[PDB]
């Protein structure tokens, strides 16, 4: 029901918009290094401006930006109070995506004035991958839209 997208967007710095939707919007972090499948990695996440629903599957041309396609899609779910969540800085969350499933955290620093950096974290469980035997960015780096 909830949409989710992740696009490899290869502006300026090559990074990947994670996107969640809440409340009839896409709550978004610009993840420079990409999503990774080992929970022992985490990876930053800077909070960005929230993306209305169906910019989820835009592909083409950003101006200053560069090339966005759309590297992953699917459904999400909170695991617990997702508004709240937000708020406080800790979301709890499992994907139902193409490339990425299994359960998640979004995790905020709480320093003052660093309150737009958060990390993405996979959680323990049959979906998480050693990183240095499986890089999900390099194994299926395609678009789950336009591919061939
Ligand atoms: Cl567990
Ligand atoms: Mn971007
Ligand atoms: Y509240
Ligand atoms: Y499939
Ligand atoms: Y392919
Ligand atoms: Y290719």
């Not at 695991?79 to 490339?99: I, M």
């Not at 050693?130 to 194994?139: A, G, H, I, M, Y």
């Amino acid at each position: 029901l909830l949409r989710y997208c992740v696009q490899k967007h290869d502006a300026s710095r090559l990074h990947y918009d994670f996107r969640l939707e809440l409340d009839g919007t896409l709550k978004s972090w610009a993840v420079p290094k990409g999503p990774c499948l080992d929970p022992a990695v985490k990876r930053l996440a800077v909070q960005v401006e929230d993306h209305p629903l169906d910019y989820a599957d835009f592909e083409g041309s950003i101006p200053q930006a560069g090339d966005v396609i759309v590297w992953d899609r699917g459904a999400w779910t909170p695991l617990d109070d997702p508004r709240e969540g937000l708020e406080k800085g800790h979301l709890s969350f499992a994907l139902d995506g193409e490339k990425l499933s299994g359960r998640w955290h979004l995790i905020r620093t709480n320093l003052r004035g660093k309150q737009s950096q958060w990390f993405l974290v996979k959680a323990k469980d049959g979906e998480a991958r050693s990183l240095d035997r499986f890089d999900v960015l390099k194994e299926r780096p395609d678009s789950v839209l336009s591919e061939r």
